[PDB]
Design a protein around this ligand. Structure first.
Ligand SMILES: *[C@@H]1O[C@H](CO[C@@H]2O[C@@H](C)[C@@H](O)[C@@H](O)[C@@H]2O)[C@@H](O[C@@H]2O[C@H](CO)[C@@H](O[C@@H]3O[C@H](CO[C@H]4O[C@H](CO)[C@@H](O)[C@H](O)[C@@H]4O[C@@H]4O[C@H](CO)[C@@H](O)[C@H](O)[C@H]4NC(C)=O)[C@@H](O)[C@H](O[C@H]4O[C@H](CO)[C@@H](O)[C@H](O)[C@@H]4O[C@@H]4O[C@H](CO)[C@@H](O)[C@H](O)[C@H]4NC(C)=O)[C@@H]3O)[C@H](O)[C@H]2NC(C)=O)[C@H](O)[C@H]1NC(C)=O
Ligand SMILES: *[C@@H]1O[C@H](CO[C@@H]2O[C@@H](C)[C@@H](O)[C@@H](O)[C@@H]2O)[C@@H](O[C@@H]2O[C@H](CO)[C@@H](O[C@@H]3O[C@H](CO[C@H]4O[C@H](CO)[C@@H](O)[C@H](O)[C@@H]4O[C@@H]4O[C@H](CO)[C@@H](O)[C@H](O)[C@H]4NC(C)=O)[C@@H](O)[C@H](O[C@H]4O[C@H](CO)[C@@H](O)[C@H](O)[C@@H]4O[C@@H]4O[C@H](CO)[C@@H](O)[C@H](O)[C@H]4NC(C)=O)[C@@H]3O)[C@H](O)[C@H]2NC(C)=O)[C@H](O)[C@H]1NC(C)=O
Lengths: 207, 207
């Protein structure tokens, strides 16, 4: 039979009133022998009906795929409400069911530290600048880099990972050409997360 | 139905002969009535016979997991020989087969740098020493922390991260306490990797 996938809102959508956070329920591998798919949404037990269900799109398997999308309220998601996608189809013996939410626990405030490049990286052409983010819970974050109010292109950010305390941490490595660091250009690590004041902090690094 | 995964040896294991690099074939969702499970292992198309089907256990899934591990040689796995776990079963339609190998690509030597604690981490009790390993390929790697010969225990390690130049990087956060740093203890990041001379180097860090 068919398979269901329940996708959450990207982190930054739930921290800015500017954005629109949503949950996407996706049914894949729907057949022509009955491609009637029915969506029932529930938040925290009680069913909602404010979901927008796109029409079936057949794929190149020769299989149908249906996407229902439910907008959330930022406070709802951050107050840890559970969202149930329920999928009905006359093939399936029993309706498939999915619950989703942010990961249960107590919010823990991240601590950001910026580390200048190691002295030995001076002998190369492009030095690495480091942003360490520690002690945050849950793990959905957002990290990136700006220099003079404008984003920096060349940085990779490692995923979050469970520390010994049960909270998370990460690093992001921004690679700049040796000159821009030498001159004293100020660089800037910004992070977004529920347990920050106004969901935003930023620390800067410069020679 | 019987689903098959096949996991490669541990990085540390292939770079030091003291250890036993092993390829571990794992079958899942094996149901009581047909659990004979064959295994046959092949190397570069041929076949050798130094396998060892270990014992089993049981999850809350009404099913068990047979697990067979094969001993490998350190100069064959690192030379990119393909490894094949045929898993014959009558519960299965047919012989589900699988094949793994070391990732191909000219190995590249890792860059190892040691990041001392940011000034503003000094407010709080514990301090976090950073180690940055970057520019390595393939992604298999092992990092460890030690002080004056004995291994440190309070560290964590990011997974390899694919950068931009097709190299990988990673970080390591060894948490050392207040005064061990501040007194003058030397801490050391040790990296083991395919392309390192003697598959191992080390980098120090004192205040
Ligand atoms: C026939 O084809 C169809 C259609 O596919 C398309 O058309 C064909 C013709 C080909 O061209 C295809 O190449 C083409 O893609 C196939 O349909 C596919 O079906 C598979 C399932 O067999 C689905 O795989 C799952 O993928 C999800 C993640 O999917 C995201 O990322 C994809 C690429 O990165 C992207 O293509 C998807 O659209 C989707 O993208 C996200 O979409 C949301 C909603 O809009 C959006 O908000 C996101 O921003 C967006 N993200 C990105 C990056 O784009 C993955 O989660 C699944 O893995 C889980 O399940 C596995 C077991 O099923 C398990 O082994 C994994 O380890 C993992 O397990 C999960 O683990 C997590 C924690 O890690 C846990 O929380 C979960 O509980 C656990 N899961 C379970 C079930 O327990 C899975 O890999 C494809 O999405 C789907 N393709 C598309 C395009 O949707 C079909 O299979 C083909 N059939 C045959 C027989 O050939
Ligand atoms: C009944 O229970 C068992 C046991 O599960 C455990 O207990 C149950 C009861 C629950 O409590 C679970 O929460 C718990 O996990 C169930 O068995 C599980 O089955 C699922 C899928 O059905 C497996 O997911 C796969 O995961 C592997 C990686 O698994 C490692 O990590 C797991 C956790 O992260 C860990 O639990 C495993 O033990 C395993 O650990 C490894 O063990 C070996 C042993 O020697 C060791 O050497 C390793 O070092 C060690 N590693 C770690 C990190 O621990 C993953 O490989 C699979 O993903 C591939 O395949 C998917 C499709 O099957 C696909 O979605 C993925 O994207 C990915 O696809 C591959 O991608 C590559 C490149 O990306 C591509 O080239 C391939 O073509 C592609 N292959 C495809 C598409 O097929 C997969 O996600 C669980 O691991 C497994 N758990 C255990 C413990 O075995 C069982 O399913 C249950 N039955 C029912 C009916 O529910």
């Amino acid at each position: 039979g068919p398979s269901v996938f329940l996708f959450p809102p990207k982190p930054k959508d739930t921290l800015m009133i500017s954005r629109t956070p949503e949950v996407t329920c996706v049914v894949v591998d729907v057949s022509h022998e009955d491609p009637e798919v029915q969506f029932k949404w529930y938040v925290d037990g009680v069913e909602v009906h404010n979901a927008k269900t796109k029409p079936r799109e057949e794929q190149y398997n020769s299989t149908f795929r249906v996407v229902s999308v439910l907008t959330v309220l930022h406070q709802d998601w951050l107050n840890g409400k559970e969202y149930k996608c329920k999928v009905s189809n006359k093939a399936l013996p029993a309706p498939i069911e999915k619950t989703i939410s942010k990961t249960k626990g107590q919010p823990r405030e991240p601590q950001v530290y910026t580390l200048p490049p190691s002295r030995e990286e001076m002998t190369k052409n492009q030095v690495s600048l480091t942003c360490l983010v520690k002690g945050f819970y849950p793990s959905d974050i957002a990290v990136e880099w700006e220099s003079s109010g404008q984003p920096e292109n060349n940085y990779n950010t490692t995923p979050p990972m469970l520390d010994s305390d049960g909270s998370f941490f990460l690093y992001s490595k921004l690679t700049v050409d040796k000159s821009r660091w030498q001159q004293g250009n100020i660089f800037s690590c910004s992070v977004m997360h529920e347990a920050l004041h106004n969901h935003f902090t930023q620390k800067s690094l410069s020679l």
